[PDB]
């Protein structure tokens with residue numbers, strides 16, 4: 144469920160259900176971020192999940208949404224972006240990668256979200272693995288499930304956040 | 307085969323080739339007829355959308371002339387959701403939608419689903435796929451078995467198609 148999410152009430156339960164779905168699938172951390180149509184107020188987005196608060200706080204105060212390559216990717220594509228070191232291209236993105244890595248966010252992917260009413264979002268999931276090769280092996284194995292999941296999360300989350 | 311297909315789409319030139327590749331991807335997966343429809347941001351010019359696929363030409367023409375985009379419950383669904391709408395008789399609620407259902411069925415579009423498309427640049431679309439089956443139960447079984455692949459496919463199609471359309 145979807146339906147757990149849909150029949151759930153309030154942000155806390157919804158985030159809890161989404162986090163457990165992510166954890167059950169094999170991902171330790173998740174972020175669901177969503178903005179309403181033609182908003183680019185990334186630092187004020189609807190954000191759900193279990194990224195370390197200190198990371199979330201730094202990210203927002205540093206305006207990292209404007210440096211993070213996954214965010215720029217989300218504005219350009221509906222396809223997943225895997226957190227390969229090569230996505231971090233600029234000087235500031237290298238620093239971001241180092242800091243993100245320190246936060247435990249070295250391995251993962253971001254599923255862009257584009258809702259029926261112009262919502263702009265991301266469903267990011269990090270994996271704990273011994274190496275990126277392992278993480279990628281795992282992510283490929285669950286990708287089809289995740290790809291459905293992100294849209295269920297979107298449809299439910301947009302309603303929660305905005306309807 | 308899916309990522310291979312996306313790569314083919316992204317190495318294609320022109321609408322005809324792109325359309326042929328997508329149709330074959332759908333056919334290989336087990337669907338019969340497809341429609342890939344796409345509008346740019348803030349457009350509801352449904353009767354002049356970018357439309358690709360192999361729906362019967364007579365049906366497509368009839369649909370555009372009758373303005374069925376404005377009656378078809380899969381289209382309204384696409385404007386409100388990112389989740390699939392399966393072509394269950396129950397989605398055809400109004401008398402007009404019921405007439406539409408009767409006519410679509412005569413065109414061979416009895417079993418199928420529509421995957422709403424919402425592109426990164428505000429594109430509004432549909433990827434509709436029809437199923438040949440002896441009965442709805444068989445069609446639903448099939449569709450469930452390929453749903454994960456189709457769910458990824460629709461976004462690959464959207465990402466590629468959006469560039470071709472606009």
Ligand SMILES: CCCCCCCCCC(=O)CC(=O)N[C@H]1CCOC1=O
Pocket residue numbers: 174176177178185186188202208211213214217218226243244248249253263264265267268
């Ligand atoms: C696409 C706009 C969404 C609304 C703004 C959300 C801001 C947060 C997005 C985010 O944190 C993406 C993400 O998960 N990045 C990972 C990449 C590695 O470290 C991270 O924080």
Ligand SMILES: CCCCCCCCCC(=O)CC(=O)N[C@H]1CCOC1=O
Pocket residue numbers: 341343344345352353355357369375378380381384385393410411415420430431432434435
């Ligand atoms: C969401 C707007 C897309 C742009 C306009 C495309 C118009 C065509 C839409 C369409 O044909 C939907 C569809 O596949 N309908 C099926 C339902 C049963 O018979 C049909 O024609």
